[PDB]
């Protein structure tokens, strides 16, 4: 009789087994026709079983060969591709958090800057930077030892601009229009009032009318801008309006 | 039971049962093999999520995977104040 090991992973090897008979000659064949001999060992191992296959055993004792005994080596059902987040972009200074929603014996993540993890939920990259941009990949090893398809997420990193330079009109009389302005070329120029009022324009200038009781103030003003992106600039040094 | 902490407060987890070993997993790679895992001292937004546990008994058997969800709240930015001077 002949026996195999249990179902095998696609790239693994299977030890075939039979009964010990004193002074018997064993012959294992790859085909029913018994023309292609693989091994003469009692318990041979057959590498790379990538498909269901059969082996045939013939045993000769006392010069009298047996009929062939077939065995079938089964292959373990291939595990599913892991579930990863959709491609995303973070701003420099924000975090990059990755996760796998599936269950596994083990996880294996790889990526930019040597990112490596064996967890379902890898340590979060806290100060994400430009060097962290790139492809983060994953593979899953199931309960049965089989290794799933390599899947991935691309993580982009945005950058904010340098802080802008501000000027103002210095000493302003009550009837003098207040003009705050910058040297920066930018989008979303957000001017921040001493009262905590955040006002947004599209040009490097804010005109404050003398009758505007919430913006026509005096004190320290700052500016935050964006350039063709959603990342704010470093805030400008506050400037004093008189 | 499921709970929420405020950013800057701590997240303390514990198992009330006895085991040969404990196995905790969670957000940010939280990993522990203790009945009482190290407390996350500066808890932050990244620590929010599902913390799970499994128990291996004296006999080698591995119990059901159970869990707690820990939420994290955030405080607002400091306000700007004015007054009437003199």
mmCIF file of C-alpha atoms in Angstrom:
data_model
loop_
_atom_site.group_PDB
_atom_site.id
_atom_site.type_symbol
_atom_site.label_atom_id
_atom_site.label_comp_id
_atom_site.label_asym_id
_atom_site.label_seq_id
_atom_site.Cartn_x
_atom_site.Cartn_y
_atom_site.Cartn_z
ATOM 1 C CA UNK A 1 0.000 0.000 0.000
ATOM 2 C CA UNK A 2 1.228 3.541 -0.249
ATOM 3 C CA UNK A 3 0.490 6.768 1.528
ATOM 4 C CA UNK A 4 1.220 10.424 1.031
ATOM 5 C CA UNK A 5 1.584 13.287 3.380
ATOM 6 C CA UNK A 6 -1.472 15.463 3.782
ATOM 7 C CA UNK A 7 -2.375 18.176 1.280
ATOM 8 C CA UNK A 8 0.672 20.187 0.327
ATOM 9 C CA UNK A 9 1.360 23.865 -0.291
ATOM 10 C CA UNK A 10 2.028 24.704 -3.948
ATOM 11 C CA UNK A 11 5.796 25.003 -3.721
ATOM 12 C CA UNK A 12 6.455 22.346 -1.089
ATOM 13 C CA UNK A 13 7.625 18.760 -1.102
ATOM 14 C CA UNK A 14 5.794 15.587 -0.219
ATOM 15 C CA UNK A 15 7.200 12.605 1.508
ATOM 16 C CA UNK A 16 5.677 9.425 0.159
ATOM 17 C CA UNK A 17 5.543 6.380 2.417
ATOM 18 C CA UNK A 18 5.103 2.629 2.338
ATOM 19 C CA UNK A 19 5.330 -0.571 4.389
ATOM 20 C CA UNK A 20 8.673 -1.957 5.438
ATOM 21 C CA UNK A 21 9.310 -5.375 4.043
ATOM 22 C CA UNK A 22 12.485 -7.223 4.812
ATOM 23 C CA UNK A 23 14.825 -7.137 1.854
ATOM 24 C CA UNK A 24 12.235 -5.722 -0.530
ATOM 25 C CA UNK A 25 13.011 -3.631 -3.554
ATOM 26 C CA UNK A 26 10.888 -0.540 -3.822
ATOM 27 C CA UNK A 27 10.290 1.349 -7.045
ATOM 28 C CA UNK A 28 8.308 4.590 -7.317
ATOM 29 C CA UNK A 29 7.135 5.754 -10.715
ATOM 30 C CA UNK A 30 5.803 9.067 -12.003
ATOM 31 C CA UNK A 31 3.333 7.443 -14.364
ATOM 32 C CA UNK A 32 0.832 4.587 -14.672
ATOM 33 C CA UNK A 33 2.782 3.152 -17.583
ATOM 34 C CA UNK A 34 5.646 2.566 -15.117
ATOM 35 C CA UNK A 35 8.265 3.858 -17.535
ATOM 36 C CA UNK A 36 9.642 6.802 -15.578
ATOM 37 C CA UNK A 37 11.302 5.794 -12.331
ATOM 38 C CA UNK A 38 11.631 8.490 -9.662
ATOM 39 C CA UNK A 39 13.091 6.690 -6.698
ATOM 40 C CA UNK A 40 13.933 3.399 -5.069
ATOM 41 C CA UNK A 41 13.713 4.589 -1.487
ATOM 42 C CA UNK A 42 11.104 3.341 0.932
ATOM 43 C CA UNK A 43 10.132 6.911 1.878
ATOM 44 C CA UNK A 44 11.199 9.287 -0.967
ATOM 45 C CA UNK A 45 10.437 12.960 -1.116
ATOM 46 C CA UNK A 46 9.058 14.610 -4.211
ATOM 47 C CA UNK A 47 9.729 18.334 -4.542
ATOM 48 C CA UNK A 48 7.708 21.127 -6.131
ATOM 49 C CA UNK A 49 4.228 19.637 -6.128
ATOM 50 C CA UNK A 50 2.420 22.445 -7.895
ATOM 51 C CA UNK A 51 -0.571 20.405 -8.951
ATOM 52 C CA UNK A 52 -2.552 17.388 -7.895
ATOM 53 C CA UNK A 53 -0.538 14.384 -8.962
ATOM 54 C CA UNK A 54 -0.174 10.673 -8.531
ATOM 55 C CA UNK A 55 2.655 8.314 -7.867
ATOM 56 C CA UNK A 56 2.879 4.597 -8.395
ATOM 57 C CA UNK A 57 4.515 2.077 -6.128
ATOM 58 C CA UNK A 58 5.770 -1.311 -7.173
ATOM 59 C CA UNK A 59 7.372 -3.625 -4.639
ATOM 60 C CA UNK A 60 9.441 -6.635 -5.576
ATOM 61 C CA UNK A 61 10.023 -9.411 -3.112
ATOM 62 C CA UNK A 62 11.596 -12.777 -3.808
ATOM 63 C CA UNK A 63 11.946 -11.715 -7.468
ATOM 64 C CA UNK A 64 8.071 -11.207 -7.752
ATOM 65 C CA UNK A 65 6.918 -7.574 -8.419
ATOM 66 C CA UNK A 66 3.572 -6.398 -7.130
ATOM 67 C CA UNK A 67 0.954 -4.638 -9.138
ATOM 68 C CA UNK A 68 1.249 -0.867 -8.971
ATOM 69 C CA UNK A 69 -0.306 1.069 -6.132
ATOM 70 C CA UNK A 70 -1.381 4.582 -6.848
ATOM 71 C CA UNK A 71 -1.388 7.387 -4.345
ATOM 72 C CA UNK A 72 -2.740 10.892 -4.884
ATOM 73 C CA UNK A 73 -1.128 14.025 -3.584
ATOM 74 C CA UNK A 74 -3.633 16.761 -3.001
ATOM 75 C CA UNK A 75 -2.727 20.509 -3.122
ATOM 76 C CA UNK A 76 -4.135 22.798 -0.271
ATOM 77 C CA UNK A 77 -6.577 25.420 -1.572
ATOM 78 C CA UNK A 78 -4.748 28.728 -2.276
ATOM 79 C CA UNK A 79 -5.567 31.502 0.318
ATOM 80 C CA UNK A 80 -7.252 34.742 -0.736
ATOM 81 C CA UNK A 81 -5.563 38.039 -1.505
ATOM 82 C CA UNK A 82 -5.416 40.221 1.743
ATOM 83 C CA UNK A 83 -7.562 43.308 2.297
ATOM 84 C CA UNK A 84 -5.604 46.600 2.221
ATOM 85 C CA UNK A 85 -6.759 50.315 2.356
ATOM 86 C CA UNK A 86 -7.217 52.238 -0.876
ATOM 87 C CA UNK A 87 -4.385 54.423 -2.164
ATOM 88 C CA UNK A 88 -4.057 57.535 -0.053
ATOM 89 C CA UNK A 89 -2.078 60.673 0.540
ATOM 90 C CA UNK A 90 -0.977 62.239 3.823
ATOM 91 C CA UNK A 91 0.720 65.641 4.467
ATOM 92 C CA UNK A 92 4.259 65.751 5.812
ATOM 93 C CA UNK A 93 4.020 65.792 9.612
ATOM 94 C CA UNK A 94 0.804 63.717 9.650
ATOM 95 C CA UNK A 95 0.822 60.007 10.280
ATOM 96 C CA UNK A 96 0.728 56.934 8.034
ATOM 97 C CA UNK A 97 -1.390 54.156 9.450
ATOM 98 C CA UNK A 98 -1.687 50.809 7.726
ATOM 99 C CA UNK A 99 -3.845 47.814 8.538
ATOM 100 C CA UNK A 100 -5.014 44.434 7.278
ATOM 101 C CA UNK A 101 -8.673 43.532 7.819
ATOM 102 C CA UNK A 102 -8.147 39.776 7.381
ATOM 103 C CA UNK A 103 -7.132 37.023 9.807
ATOM 104 C CA UNK A 104 -3.846 35.164 9.426
ATOM 105 C CA UNK A 105 -1.257 33.006 11.152
ATOM 106 C CA UNK A 106 1.213 35.695 10.252
ATOM 107 C CA UNK A 107 1.465 38.961 8.438
ATOM 108 C CA UNK A 108 4.392 40.278 6.462
ATOM 109 C CA UNK A 109 4.554 43.941 5.488
ATOM 110 C CA UNK A 110 7.365 45.664 3.646
ATOM 111 C CA UNK A 111 7.969 49.189 2.326
ATOM 112 C CA UNK A 112 9.920 52.498 1.940
ATOM 113 C CA UNK A 113 12.654 53.288 4.440
ATOM 114 C CA UNK A 114 12.820 49.659 5.438
ATOM 115 C CA UNK A 115 9.347 49.619 6.854
ATOM 116 C CA UNK A 116 8.895 46.133 8.133
ATOM 117 C CA UNK A 117 6.130 44.551 10.160
ATOM 118 C CA UNK A 118 4.677 41.213 11.106
ATOM 119 C CA UNK A 119 1.479 42.594 12.584
ATOM 120 C CA UNK A 120 -2.117 43.036 11.514
ATOM 121 C CA UNK A 121 -1.721 46.646 12.669
ATOM 122 C CA UNK A 122 1.941 47.832 12.222
ATOM 123 C CA UNK A 123 3.345 50.674 14.202
ATOM 124 C CA UNK A 124 2.134 53.939 12.791
ATOM 125 C CA UNK A 125 4.689 56.164 11.179
ATOM 126 C CA UNK A 126 4.236 59.191 13.353
ATOM 127 C CA UNK A 127 6.342 62.009 11.721
ATOM 128 C CA UNK A 128 5.592 60.936 8.178
ATOM 129 C CA UNK A 129 7.984 62.463 5.686
ATOM 130 C CA UNK A 130 8.762 62.544 1.989
ATOM 131 C CA UNK A 131 10.994 59.516 2.278
ATOM 132 C CA UNK A 132 8.033 57.463 3.504
ATOM 133 C CA UNK A 133 6.180 57.867 0.234
ATOM 134 C CA UNK A 134 5.961 54.727 -1.880
ATOM 135 C CA UNK A 135 4.500 51.236 -2.168
ATOM 136 C CA UNK A 136 3.629 49.310 0.972
ATOM 137 C CA UNK A 137 3.110 45.615 0.304
ATOM 138 C CA UNK A 138 1.626 42.639 2.182
ATOM 139 C CA UNK A 139 1.498 38.989 2.229
ATOM 140 C CA UNK A 140 -0.478 36.590 4.349
ATOM 141 C CA UNK A 141 0.309 33.171 5.648
ATOM 142 C CA UNK A 142 -2.774 31.174 6.472
ATOM 143 C CA UNK A 143 -3.487 28.477 9.112
ATOM 144 C CA UNK A 144 -2.522 25.845 6.628
ATOM 145 C CA UNK A 145 0.946 27.279 5.871
ATOM 146 C CA UNK A 146 0.118 28.570 2.390
ATOM 147 C CA UNK A 147 1.324 32.108 1.340
ATOM 148 C CA UNK A 148 -1.203 34.383 -0.381
ATOM 149 C CA UNK A 149 -0.797 36.839 -3.228
ATOM 150 C CA UNK A 150 1.257 39.987 -2.724
ATOM 151 C CA UNK A 151 -1.065 43.019 -2.512
ATOM 152 C CA UNK A 152 -0.407 46.716 -1.925
ATOM 153 C CA UNK A 153 -1.237 50.347 -1.147
ATOM 154 C CA UNK A 154 0.516 53.391 -2.451
ATOM 155 C CA UNK A 155 1.007 56.136 0.044
ATOM 156 C CA UNK A 156 1.762 59.592 -1.226
ATOM 157 C CA UNK A 157 3.157 62.467 0.812
ATOM 158 C CA UNK A 158 2.253 66.137 0.321
ATOM 159 C CA UNK A 159 4.376 69.064 1.425
ATOM 160 C CA UNK A 160 3.486 72.491 2.748
ATOM 161 C CA UNK A 161 5.296 75.694 1.601
ATOM 162 C CA UNK A 162 7.702 77.911 3.532
ATOM 163 C CA UNK A 163 6.186 80.556 5.762
ATOM 164 C CA UNK A 164 5.394 83.876 3.929
ATOM 165 C CA UNK A 165 6.817 87.316 4.693
ATOM 166 C CA UNK A 166 4.319 89.919 5.900
ATOM 167 C CA UNK A 167 4.091 93.666 5.750
ATOM 168 C CA UNK A 168 1.440 96.140 6.951
ATOM 169 C CA UNK A 169 0.794 99.897 7.110
ATOM 170 C CA UNK A 170 2.334 100.499 10.575
ATOM 171 C CA UNK A 171 0.675 103.456 12.343
ATOM 172 C CA UNK A 172 -2.823 103.827 10.938
ATOM 173 C CA UNK A 173 -5.304 106.607 11.758
ATOM 174 C CA UNK A 174 -8.965 105.729 12.303
ATOM 175 C CA UNK A 175 -9.911 106.687 8.718
ATOM 176 C CA UNK A 176 -7.001 104.828 7.050
ATOM 177 C CA UNK A 177 -7.682 101.566 5.223
ATOM 178 C CA UNK A 178 -5.621 98.678 6.610
ATOM 179 C CA UNK A 179 -3.805 96.677 3.975
ATOM 180 C CA UNK A 180 -2.092 93.480 4.970
ATOM 181 C CA UNK A 181 0.061 91.865 2.363
ATOM 182 C CA UNK A 182 2.612 89.285 1.452
ATOM 183 C CA UNK A 183 5.394 88.463 -0.920
ATOM 184 C CA UNK A 184 4.229 84.877 -1.392
ATOM 185 C CA UNK A 185 2.612 83.400 -4.479
ATOM 186 C CA UNK A 186 -0.013 81.057 -3.113
ATOM 187 C CA UNK A 187 -3.540 79.689 -2.852
ATOM 188 C CA UNK A 188 -5.786 79.859 0.220
ATOM 189 C CA UNK A 189 -3.934 82.740 1.804
ATOM 190 C CA UNK A 190 -5.504 82.536 5.321
ATOM 191 C CA UNK A 191 -5.062 85.766 7.312
ATOM 192 C CA UNK A 192 -5.351 85.349 11.053
ATOM 193 C CA UNK A 193 -6.726 88.209 13.118
ATOM 194 C CA UNK A 194 -5.603 88.985 16.742
ATOM 195 C CA UNK A 195 -9.132 88.071 17.770
ATOM 196 C CA UNK A 196 -8.796 84.550 16.367
ATOM 197 C CA UNK A 197 -10.725 85.139 13.170
ATOM 198 C CA UNK A 198 -9.494 83.105 10.189
ATOM 199 C CA UNK A 199 -10.320 84.814 6.827
ATOM 200 C CA UNK A 200 -9.438 83.359 3.426
ATOM 201 C CA UNK A 201 -8.481 84.956 0.114
ATOM 202 C CA UNK A 202 -7.016 84.101 -3.277
ATOM 203 C CA UNK A 203 -4.531 86.961 -3.528
ATOM 204 C CA UNK A 204 -1.530 88.097 -1.499
ATOM 205 C CA UNK A 205 -3.484 90.930 0.093
ATOM 206 C CA UNK A 206 -6.239 91.573 2.605
ATOM 207 C CA UNK A 207 -8.108 94.864 2.581
ATOM 208 C CA UNK A 208 -9.677 95.819 5.822
ATOM 209 C CA UNK A 209 -12.217 98.597 5.721
ATOM 210 C CA UNK A 210 -12.127 101.085 8.734
ATOM 211 C CA UNK A 211 -15.770 100.286 9.558
ATOM 212 C CA UNK A 212 -15.064 96.575 9.901
ATOM 213 C CA UNK A 213 -15.225 96.151 13.638
ATOM 214 C CA UNK A 214 -13.905 92.557 13.753
ATOM 215 C CA UNK A 215 -10.943 92.779 11.383
ATOM 216 C CA UNK A 216 -9.943 96.463 11.627
ATOM 217 C CA UNK A 217 -8.002 95.784 14.751
ATOM 218 C CA UNK A 218 -4.447 96.317 15.808
ATOM 219 C CA UNK A 219 -2.057 93.798 17.288
ATOM 220 C CA UNK A 220 -0.188 90.763 16.011
ATOM 221 C CA UNK A 221 -1.353 89.265 12.684
ATOM 222 C CA UNK A 222 -0.105 86.070 10.998
ATOM 223 C CA UNK A 223 -0.525 84.247 7.676
ATOM 224 C CA UNK A 224 -0.806 80.597 6.641
ATOM 225 C CA UNK A 225 -0.822 79.660 2.897
ATOM 226 C CA UNK A 226 -1.074 76.607 0.570
ATOM 227 C CA UNK A 227 0.457 76.025 -2.885
ATOM 228 C CA UNK A 228 -1.472 73.790 -5.304
ATOM 229 C CA UNK A 229 -2.124 71.420 -2.430
ATOM 230 C CA UNK A 230 -3.995 70.966 0.847
ATOM 231 C CA UNK A 231 -0.852 71.411 3.143
ATOM 232 C CA UNK A 232 -0.623 74.711 5.095
ATOM 233 C CA UNK A 233 2.565 76.700 5.201
ATOM 234 C CA UNK A 234 4.524 77.107 8.298
ATOM 235 C CA UNK A 235 2.783 80.200 9.846
ATOM 236 C CA UNK A 236 4.544 83.514 9.280
ATOM 237 C CA UNK A 237 6.173 85.385 12.078
ATOM 238 C CA UNK A 238 3.431 87.590 13.566
ATOM 239 C CA UNK A 239 3.624 91.256 12.655
ATOM 240 C CA UNK A 240 2.333 94.201 14.631
ATOM 241 C CA UNK A 241 -0.358 96.462 13.225
ATOM 242 C CA UNK A 242 -0.635 99.979 14.832
ATOM 243 C CA UNK B 1 -16.278 47.136 28.655
ATOM 244 C CA UNK B 2 -15.800 49.481 25.701
ATOM 245 C CA UNK B 3 -14.408 52.793 26.859
ATOM 246 C CA UNK B 4 -13.152 56.166 25.779
ATOM 247 C CA UNK B 5 -10.161 58.139 27.045
ATOM 248 C CA UNK B 6 -9.080 61.747 26.222
ATOM 249 C CA UNK B 7 -5.849 62.357 24.341
ATOM 250 C CA UNK B 8 -3.087 62.725 26.936
ATOM 251 C CA UNK B 9 -4.779 60.333 29.396
ATOM 252 C CA UNK B 10 -3.768 56.720 29.694
ATOM 253 C CA UNK B 11 -5.122 53.459 28.271
ATOM 254 C CA UNK B 12 -4.973 50.615 30.741
ATOM 255 C CA UNK B 13 -6.016 47.110 29.798
ATOM 256 C CA UNK B 14 -6.324 43.991 31.911
ATOM 257 C CA UNK B 15 -7.552 40.403 31.936
ATOM 258 C CA UNK B 16 -9.298 39.171 35.086
ATOM 259 C CA UNK B 17 -8.783 35.467 34.313
ATOM 260 C CA UNK B 18 -5.902 33.076 35.000
ATOM 261 C CA UNK B 19 -3.880 31.550 32.176
ATOM 262 C CA UNK B 20 -0.635 29.850 31.218
ATOM 263 C CA UNK B 21 -0.156 32.691 28.801
ATOM 264 C CA UNK B 22 -1.846 35.783 27.533
ATOM 265 C CA UNK B 23 -1.719 37.214 24.049
ATOM 266 C CA UNK B 24 -2.874 40.768 23.392
ATOM 267 C CA UNK B 25 -2.772 42.602 20.093
ATOM 268 C CA UNK B 26 -3.899 46.033 18.872
ATOM 269 C CA UNK B 27 -3.437 49.480 17.197
ATOM 270 C CA UNK B 28 0.083 50.785 16.686
ATOM 271 C CA UNK B 29 1.459 47.303 17.105
ATOM 272 C CA UNK B 30 0.380 47.026 20.687
ATOM 273 C CA UNK B 31 1.565 43.646 21.765
ATOM 274 C CA UNK B 32 1.613 41.973 25.150
ATOM 275 C CA UNK B 33 1.896 38.602 26.794
ATOM 276 C CA UNK B 34 0.840 39.766 30.236
ATOM 277 C CA UNK B 35 -2.294 39.721 32.348
ATOM 278 C CA UNK B 36 -1.662 43.445 32.858
ATOM 279 C CA UNK B 37 0.120 44.966 29.773
ATOM 280 C CA UNK B 38 2.123 48.114 30.010
ATOM 281 C CA UNK B 39 -0.173 51.086 30.128
ATOM 282 C CA UNK B 40 -0.124 53.411 27.183
ATOM 283 C CA UNK B 41 0.840 56.561 28.985
ATOM 284 C CA UNK B 42 0.512 59.423 26.388
ATOM 285 C CA UNK B 43 -2.527 57.952 24.697
ATOM 286 C CA UNK B 44 -3.159 59.487 21.303
ATOM 287 C CA UNK B 45 -5.523 59.306 18.361
ATOM 288 C CA UNK B 46 -3.483 56.573 16.747
ATOM 289 C CA UNK B 47 -4.107 54.340 19.764
ATOM 290 C CA UNK B 48 -7.832 54.239 19.134
ATOM 291 C CA UNK B 49 -9.156 50.910 17.890
ATOM 292 C CA UNK B 50 -9.804 47.272 18.755
ATOM 293 C CA UNK B 51 -7.669 45.564 21.372
ATOM 294 C CA UNK B 52 -7.992 41.789 21.262
ATOM 295 C CA UNK B 53 -7.062 38.860 23.530
ATOM 296 C CA UNK B 54 -6.599 35.237 23.573
ATOM 297 C CA UNK B 55 -5.871 32.848 26.388
ATOM 298 C CA UNK B 56 -3.906 29.668 26.522
ATOM 299 C CA UNK B 57 -4.922 27.440 29.380
ATOM 300 C CA UNK B 58 -2.966 24.939 31.540
ATOM 301 C CA UNK B 59 -3.903 22.206 29.159
ATOM 302 C CA UNK B 60 -2.516 23.923 26.032
ATOM 303 C CA UNK B 61 -5.886 24.790 24.495
ATOM 304 C CA UNK B 62 -6.431 28.324 22.981
ATOM 305 C CA UNK B 63 -9.650 30.147 23.898
ATOM 306 C CA UNK B 64 -11.924 32.357 21.838
ATOM 307 C CA UNK B 65 -10.692 35.738 20.644
ATOM 308 C CA UNK B 66 -12.402 38.513 22.645
ATOM 309 C CA UNK B 67 -12.055 42.297 22.595
ATOM 310 C CA UNK B 68 -12.483 45.876 23.816
ATOM 311 C CA UNK B 69 -12.813 48.955 21.706
ATOM 312 C CA UNK B 70 -10.972 51.956 22.972
ATOM 313 C CA UNK B 71 -11.957 55.340 21.666
ATOM 314 C CA UNK B 72 -9.921 58.523 21.946
ATOM 315 C CA UNK B 73 -11.374 62.015 22.420
ATOM 316 C CA UNK B 74 -9.606 65.242 21.549
ATOM 317 C CA UNK B 75 -9.625 68.663 23.156
ATOM 318 C CA UNK B 76 -9.820 71.919 21.105
ATOM 319 C CA UNK B 77 -7.142 74.549 20.522
ATOM 320 C CA UNK B 78 -6.746 77.214 23.170
ATOM 321 C CA UNK B 79 -9.111 80.246 22.698
ATOM 322 C CA UNK B 80 -8.114 83.874 22.164
ATOM 323 C CA UNK B 81 -9.111 86.298 24.922
ATOM 324 C CA UNK B 82 -9.891 89.969 25.091
ATOM 325 C CA UNK B 83 -10.972 92.246 27.961
ATOM 326 C CA UNK B 84 -11.776 95.912 28.649
ATOM 327 C CA UNK B 85 -8.237 96.994 29.670
ATOM 328 C CA UNK B 86 -8.329 99.909 32.143
#
